Write a protein that binds this DNA or RNA. Structure first.
Ligand SMILES: CC[C@H]1CN2CCc3cc(OC)c(OC)cc3[C@@H]2C[C@@H]1C[C@H]1NCCc2cc(O)c(OC)cc21
Ligand SMILES: [Mg+2]
Ligand SMILES: [Mg+2]
Ligand SMILES: [Mg+2]
Ligand SMILES: [Mg+2]
Ligand SMILES: [Mg+2]
Ligand SMILES: [Mg+2]
Ligand SMILES: [Mg+2]
Ligand SMILES: [Mg+2]
Ligand SMILES: [Mg+2]
Ligand SMILES: [Mg+2]
Ligand SMILES: [Mg+2]
Ligand SMILES: [Mg+2]
Ligand SMILES: [Mg+2]
Ligand SMILES: [Mg+2]
Ligand SMILES: [Mg+2]
Ligand SMILES: [Mg+2]
Ligand SMILES: [Mg+2]
Ligand SMILES: [Mg+2]
Ligand SMILES: [Mg+2]
Ligand SMILES: [Mg+2]
Ligand SMILES: [Mg+2]
Ligand SMILES: [Mg+2]
Ligand SMILES: [Mg+2]
Ligand SMILES: [Mg+2]
Ligand SMILES: [Mg+2]
Ligand SMILES: [Mg+2]
Ligand SMILES: [Mg+2]
Ligand SMILES: [Mg+2]
Ligand SMILES: [Mg+2]
Ligand SMILES: [Mg+2]
Ligand SMILES: [Mg+2]
Ligand SMILES: [Mg+2]
Ligand SMILES: [Mg+2]
Ligand SMILES: [Mg+2]
Ligand SMILES: [Mg+2]
Ligand SMILES: [Mg+2]
Ligand SMILES: [Mg+2]
Ligand SMILES: [Mg+2]
Ligand SMILES: [Mg+2]
Ligand SMILES: [Mg+2]
Ligand SMILES: [Mg+2]
Ligand SMILES: [Mg+2]
Ligand SMILES: [Mg+2]
Ligand SMILES: [Mg+2]
Ligand SMILES: [Mg+2]
Ligand SMILES: [Mg+2]
Ligand SMILES: [Mg+2]
Ligand SMILES: [Mg+2]
Ligand SMILES: [Mg+2]
Ligand SMILES: [Mg+2]
Ligand SMILES: [Mg+2]
Ligand SMILES: [Mg+2]
Ligand SMILES: [Mg+2]
Ligand SMILES: [Mg+2]
Ligand SMILES: [Mg+2]
Ligand SMILES: [Mg+2]
Ligand SMILES: [Mg+2]
Ligand SMILES: [Mg+2]
Ligand SMILES: [Mg+2]
Ligand SMILES: [Mg+2]
Ligand SMILES: [Mg+2]
Ligand SMILES: [Mg+2]
Lengths: 185, 260, 178
RNA sequence: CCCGUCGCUACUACCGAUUGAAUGGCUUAGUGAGGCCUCCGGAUUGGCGAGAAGCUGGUCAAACUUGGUCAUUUAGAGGAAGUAAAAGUCGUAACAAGGUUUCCGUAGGUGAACCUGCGGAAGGAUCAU
RNA sequence: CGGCACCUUACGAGAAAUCAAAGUCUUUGGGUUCUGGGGGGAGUAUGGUCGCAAGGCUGAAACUUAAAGGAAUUGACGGAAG
RNA sequence: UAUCUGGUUGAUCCUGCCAGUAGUCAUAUGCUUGUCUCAAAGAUUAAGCCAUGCAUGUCUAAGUAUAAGCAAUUUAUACAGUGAAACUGCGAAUGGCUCAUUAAAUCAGUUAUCGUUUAUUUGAUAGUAUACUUGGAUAACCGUGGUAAUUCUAGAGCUAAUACAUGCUUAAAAUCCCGACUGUUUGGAAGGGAUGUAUUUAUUAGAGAUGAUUCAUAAUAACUUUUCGAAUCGCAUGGCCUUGUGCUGGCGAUGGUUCAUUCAAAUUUCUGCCCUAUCAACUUUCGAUGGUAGGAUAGUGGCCUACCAUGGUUUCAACGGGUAACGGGGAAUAAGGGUUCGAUUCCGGAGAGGGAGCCUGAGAAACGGCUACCACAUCCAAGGAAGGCAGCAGGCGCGCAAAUUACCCAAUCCCGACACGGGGAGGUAGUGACAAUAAAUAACGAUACAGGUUGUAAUUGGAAUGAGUACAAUGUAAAUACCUUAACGAGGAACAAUUGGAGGGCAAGUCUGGUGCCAGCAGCCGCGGUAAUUCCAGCUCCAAAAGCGUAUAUUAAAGUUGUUGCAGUUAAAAAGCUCGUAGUUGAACCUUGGGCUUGGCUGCAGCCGAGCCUUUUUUACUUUGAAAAAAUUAGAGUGUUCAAAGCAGGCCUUUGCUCGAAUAUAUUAGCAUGGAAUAAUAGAAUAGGACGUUAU
RNA sequence: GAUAAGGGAAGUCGGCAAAAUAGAUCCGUAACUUCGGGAUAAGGAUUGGCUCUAAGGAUCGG
């Protein structure tokens, strides 16, 4: 089937190589998962050595991290907004690594308000603890603005066709400014 | 081609087994085990070709299936078990203890040892690193894993294994002046002291060794095995010859005087 | 399969088949030593040619060379042991001076005839082939058996031979039994 | 001594209408088995799950038809050679100043060797006035 | 000093004719380009390329053959000289 | 043995080939063949086609036994011995065969994985926030069958697990987050969650290892169609009393997560392949070279996708074509240098009629596995079904060209649950003039003569022996043969040696008969036309000899391929003449001499090494070393009865002692290293030059 | 002026008449040659509708 051997290519000098041997099983490839967004559907793949891979054919949620705050939460994935490799993956909402997605902002807003008390009935000790956490509660404008829409920009870090996970981190800093420029154009 | 080989042609066997050409098509293929295939001695070879206790492979299996043969204080019933350097073989029925140490001719000597010395062994530290839960461990040359070693132990050191509990009695740091046996190359089996270690980053470090007869040779650090803290103080009994290499003319003179 | 077993030729034929000088020398040497054919002379010439080749190779090396000393002494020792080289000519220069008659002197057939056990060299060959001669306490029926110096004194009739104290042979037993 | 047409016999290779023929590899295009992945499907079968046939779209892709190309063999009316055989016919071109010195390049002519023009060479029949 | 040559000798070379290079080469090595490998078939056939053409350049094989050839010697012959 | 000889002419010296000559682990063939050891063998042509039989199976006390199997009553009424059938596990990916493909491919040497997977072996490693032990299937089995036909299987009724699917049992703390209440200068807190290990992210140690890492490892926040932290099996049965089926526990089977190790695998660095230019440009549509992101993979990588650049190789021979090309270790021949061969006993690769795709599994793109197509091909009741000898033996075909449808697991080893089973792997014999070793076919007297005290030529004797045949013993798994050995076994010792030759090369007739340019011979030169040294024969002789000849290939001879080492005025061959790029090749020159002390080795000298004093950048080359499979080669030792071989063996005779199984060679490339001649290379010229070690 | 099963020039002096081909884009293109051609040689693939995406400009403002 799909083969990863380099024998079928022509050499750096351009010479066509003769057929050396039949396709070997230790050089096979398989077909892309092409992970979509929908109710979770994962198929296992038996790989070399008896190990296991997971094709995420459909996923809804994922584990996304707020790097600055050091917090990770499971949240829904809304859709794919940008993909540096192929724009047809944005059009068809195909989740791969390094795909820019919109994630539900509610778990992070809930953590933020419960942790600091601001927005984007308590005891005296709780109010003092919040006052201690104050000053560090001011986040980037480009991140704060998104909470009004309830959806944060994130980039997929896992490989869904390899692990079955569609996980990522929340865009921040000049990387967020970079993809904002890409999106607005 | 499609999987592991299970046969060993007689001509392709290691030469230090000293197998004859015409006894058959095949040679004993050593099993997977503590020692590498090329640097091991299967118990069938030891019991039939060396000791001549067994007359054939059927007899070596009859011997071992009666629970007589022990390697490193444990009963082995695998006739092709890969015994190797510094391993102790015990046959308490004959009340014999052997240690597999190279002689100066490049072969595994039939080296009988006392019962007190058969209670331990030496192992060259291949690597020291941290296991799970941050527990340090040492890997010796025979694949042993000893946890919680002395924090002073590093690679190329020699540890003394209790061989009944598997623990470390004490160790020898690799340094100049240490007694050494060579375990590879054309200087295999020679014994001397380290004179100077010449380092080559990205390559192979070389060790200069001086014999007791003040002969100097160079060998790879990977072929260097520390066996004593200084000259004339080995931690194991050396085989006959003390790892001193004689020229062929000297050997001929010695044989002439020995035989008259 | 099993490892191959080594074998080699022990002679070499002359390059020029017809040469009166060589033919006459060969026939004279075969007649002197009671040889069956010319191949028994070719064999001696072949092994002397390779003894000479080895000595020449060592002689090109410097004196006191470890290889020249070791292999030269071994080759000299072997030739002295079989009696081809004299005890006062152990120099590896007299090895080159050796001749095929030196080797033919040391054959069992020649020594049997020269010890008086046979009337002629041709009687020696048939005595050997007919299992009458023993070296030490071992019967040798190979005429080309090269006699060693320590074996020179132990050449005699087999103890169970008609000529050496055994019973009478087939012919005598058939004659005296009728 | 010797050259070449011409005549007889035999062999080898060549050209040649026949859009000649046969065999093998590669390949465009078309058609395309089967497995694998995927998509639904839902015989029946356990307490929502398992799940067969089949279906959607892909993927690897054997194989066939046509065309192209490469490669190896082979027929052929006739044409034009070479060699061997014998020294058959015609002449006498070369070897002597071979009876017109011979040879080279080139170009005409001619049954054949060859002859002639132009320019060379001496390997000349002159190392010389 | 450079040329075009010539005469003598043969240290030397060569199969010899002869050669001051055709020497300093089995006592074999200053640098470098090209070409040949018995005689024919044959500078032919085929493919390519250049040319208006004539042709040039590159360039086989089958088959056939015991010599072909070089220099010199003696003789014989000459429509060569004395 | 570093060698030559015949043929051009009337004669000569050359060039030059033809011919002769020897070997072949080199094939075929002709003639011949007594013994011992050893032993190749359907590669070449057709990786062409195959009848038949066999070549892979496997059970221990320790996974599962209600055989309606056998056996005995025994410590046993849950079973208990042995043990078919089945389920489960493992193996079947090894081996064996062949050389079709394949020309930077394979392969060799040398590297790498800080770029991955790894059953198994061997070491370590898991107290993690209904339990006196959970379910329901299924086989074998019983009995109803369908088909002409297969190692096809269908309904129905049972029943098990180390099969399948689930599931609890536990230390002590401690830490983190949320936090009602509370203290009230920021502390205390009830109550909730989270802790092992795997997965996947993000963020922090990593200032123990490495030459080097984002390494090992740890931490924080979470995540997961939630990995596994034993619902298993055999033997012993012990200890404590709180004598309750109380609590505890000994040696093992099997299994399990992760790390290590081992057996491996997959990619991978550098250098190195034969002929061809009548192959000079190739690659890049539709991946060619690189960049970014992803997918896929066990993992790196244009491996694949999207986008973007326009790159990459080449006269230092790319690309194409040919190969009667698998590579190497090696083989033949060899003064040296070379030339030729390597299908084939070992290693690597590849394939199983041609392609392609997969399942299972740690491992296969497997073919004594499957699926499909193509080509062949088998049975058929015509509906269908089953195939793959380049495994062993055997057959056909092809051809110049190659053996038994034999015996066995006894050895060597391998596989399995395994002390027990299996193995055409392997061993044994059969055929076998492929090659190789040793080695018979006669020896000795007396007469008679010839002869110079003895060499024979004849007719006269008595000895000797194995070829063969055989008791027997040995050999062997059983045999055969060998080795030993009773009895038999030689005068024409018919127990009878052949193959080629006798002009030259080239050793050995100018004998006799036959033929008469015929028949024939003759590698070449030549012989044969009536005394043929050459044909056909007899005699005799010569050469090698159990072997000898012939054909073809190849090597030497061939200094007729020439680097060593040819030739080019006229024998073949200097381009018609200059220019000119690559290539090859290029003047001289830079620390020499002197002095002192000292080590070693050869017989006062000589030869090497030193150490001081005298103003004191890149290669190439060469030395040494490390690492470099065995077999083969050379070579040490060693009475296989000698030898080819083999790696044995030797000791006063051993309830054991004991030398061994050396050593060299490899050679380009890489690695490390000493030397600085020879040959390159760079530097300070618009000075942007060098030193200031502590200059400002 | 159309159509026609199966065959496909057997019809006829003769393929007369008719049929077949046909635009565009991309691929591919032989002999021969006066080197200009032959050439649209031959021979293949695609083409609708809809919803999108990308590229290709002008004038002002430093
Ligand atoms: C009413 C007009 C038609 C009627 N239809 C009926 C069907 C039919 C079918 C046919 O075959 C199926 C056919 O064959 C030709 C013709 C017809 C007639 C032809 C006629 C026009 C024609 N009349 C004769 C010539 C001519 C010239 C022109 O300039 C011109 O332009 C207006 C037209 C004409
Ligand atoms: Mg294999
Ligand atoms: Mg390293
Ligand atoms: Mg071709
Ligand atoms: Mg004339
Ligand atoms: Mg004339
Ligand atoms: Mg005239
Ligand atoms: Mg004339
Ligand atoms: Mg005229
Ligand atoms: Mg005129
Ligand atoms: Mg002159
Ligand atoms: Mg001159
Ligand atoms: Mg020629
Ligand atoms: Mg002539
Ligand atoms: Mg074959
Ligand atoms: Mg074979
Ligand atoms: Mg072949
Ligand atoms: Mg076949
Ligand atoms: Mg073949
Ligand atoms: Mg082929
Ligand atoms: Mg196994
Ligand atoms: Mg990548
Ligand atoms: Mg890339
Ligand atoms: Mg090439
Ligand atoms: Mg081939
Ligand atoms: Mg060979
Ligand atoms: Mg080869
Ligand atoms: Mg070859
Ligand atoms: Mg080979
Ligand atoms: Mg071989
Ligand atoms: Mg092989
Ligand atoms: Mg395969
Ligand atoms: Mg096969
Ligand atoms: Mg097939
Ligand atoms: Mg197989
Ligand atoms: Mg297959
Ligand atoms: Mg088969
Ligand atoms: Mg077969
Ligand atoms: Mg075959
Ligand atoms: Mg006979
Ligand atoms: Mg004859
Ligand atoms: Mg003669
Ligand atoms: Mg006569
Ligand atoms: Mg006559
Ligand atoms: Mg005769
Ligand atoms: Mg003949
Ligand atoms: Mg030759
Ligand atoms: Mg020549
Ligand atoms: Mg001429
Ligand atoms: Mg000429
Ligand atoms: Mg000229
Ligand atoms: Mg010039
Ligand atoms: Mg130069
Ligand atoms: Mg110079
Ligand atoms: Mg019709
Ligand atoms: Mg129709
Ligand atoms: Mg038609
Ligand atoms: Mg018609
Ligand atoms: Mg007609
Ligand atoms: Mg008609
Ligand atoms: Mg007509
Ligand atoms: Mg018309
Ligand atoms: Mg067209």
């Amino acid at each position: 089937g799909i083969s990863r051997d380099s024998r079928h290519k022509r050499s750096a000098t351009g010479a066509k190589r003769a057929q050396f041997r039949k396709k070997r099983k230790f050089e096979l490839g398989r077909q892309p998962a092409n992970t979509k967004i929908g109710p979770k559907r994962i198929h296992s793949v038996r790989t070399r050595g008896g190990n296991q891979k997971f094709r995420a054919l459909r996923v809804e949620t994922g584990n996304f991290s707020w790097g600055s705050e050091g917090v990770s939460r499971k949240t829904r994935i809304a859709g794919v907004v940008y993909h540096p490799s192929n724009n047809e993956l944005v059009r068809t909402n195909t989740l791969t690594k390094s795909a820019v997605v919109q994630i539900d902002a509610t778990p992070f807003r809930q953590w933020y308000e419960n942790h600091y008390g601001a927005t984007l009935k308590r005891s005296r000790k709780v109010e003092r603890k919040l006052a201690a956490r104050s000053g560090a509660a001011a986040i980037e404008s480009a991140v704060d603005s998104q909470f009004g829409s309830g959806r944060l920009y994130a980039v997929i870090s896992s490989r869904p066709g390899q692990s079955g996970r569609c996980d990522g981190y929340i865009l921040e800093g000049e990387e967020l400014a970079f993809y904002l420029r890409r999106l607005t154009a | 081609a499609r999987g592991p080989k299970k046969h060993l042609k007689r001509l392709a066997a290691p030469s230090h087994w000293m197998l004859d050409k015409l006894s058959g098509t095949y040679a004993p293929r050593p099993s997977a085990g503590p020692h590498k295939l090329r640097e091991s001695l299967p118990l069938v070879v030891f019991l039939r070709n060396r000791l001549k206790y067994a007359l054939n492979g059927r007899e070596v299996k009859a011997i071992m299936m009666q629970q007589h043969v022990q390697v490193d204080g444990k009963v082995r019933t695998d006739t092709t078990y890969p015994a190797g350097f510094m391993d102790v073989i015990t046959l308490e029925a004959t009340n014999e203890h052997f240690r597999l140490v190279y002689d100066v001719k490049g072969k595994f000597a039939v080296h009988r040892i006392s019962a007190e010395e058969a209670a331990y062994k030496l192992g060259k530290v291949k690597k020291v690193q941290l296991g799970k839960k941050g527990v340090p461990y040492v890997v010796t040359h025979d694949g042993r894993t000893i946890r919680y070693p002395d924090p002073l132990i590093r690679a190329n050191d020699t540890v003394k294994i209790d061989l009944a509990t598997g623990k470390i009695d004490d160790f020898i740091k690799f340094d100049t002046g240490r007694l050494v046996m060579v375990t590879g190359g054309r200087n295999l089996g020679r014994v001397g002291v380290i004179v100077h270690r010449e380092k080559h980053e990205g390559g192979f470090d070389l060790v200069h060794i001086k014999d007791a007869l003040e002969n100097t040779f160079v060998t790879r650090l990977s072929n260097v095995f520390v066996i004593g803290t200084e000259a004339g103080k080995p931690w194991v009994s050396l085989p006959k010859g003390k790892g001193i290499k004689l020229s062929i003319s000297e050997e001929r003179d010695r044989r002439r005087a020995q035989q008259g | 399969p099993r490892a191959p077993r080594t074998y080699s030729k022990t002679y070499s034929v002359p390059k020029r088949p017809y040469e009166s000088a060589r033919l006459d020398a060969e026939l004279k040497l075969a007649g002197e030593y009671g040889l069956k054919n010319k191949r028994e002379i070719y064999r001696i010439g072949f092994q002397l040619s390779k003894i000479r080749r080895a000595a020449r190779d060592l002689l090109t090396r410097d004196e006191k060379d470890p290889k020249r000393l070791f292999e030269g002494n071994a080759l000299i020792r072997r030739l002295v042991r079989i009696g081809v080289l004299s005890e006062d000519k152990m120099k590896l220069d007299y090895v080159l001076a050796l001749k095929p008659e030196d080797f033919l002197e040391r054959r069992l057939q020649t020594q049997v005839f020269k010890l008086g056990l046979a009337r002629s060299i041709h009687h020696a060959r048939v005595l050997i082939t007919q299992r009458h001669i023993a070296v030490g306490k071992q019967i040798v029926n190979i005429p080309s058996f090269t006699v060693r110096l320590d074996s020179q004194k132990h050449i005699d009739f087999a103890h169970n031979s008609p000529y050496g104290g055994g019973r009478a042979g087939r012919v005598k037993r058939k004659n005296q039994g009728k």
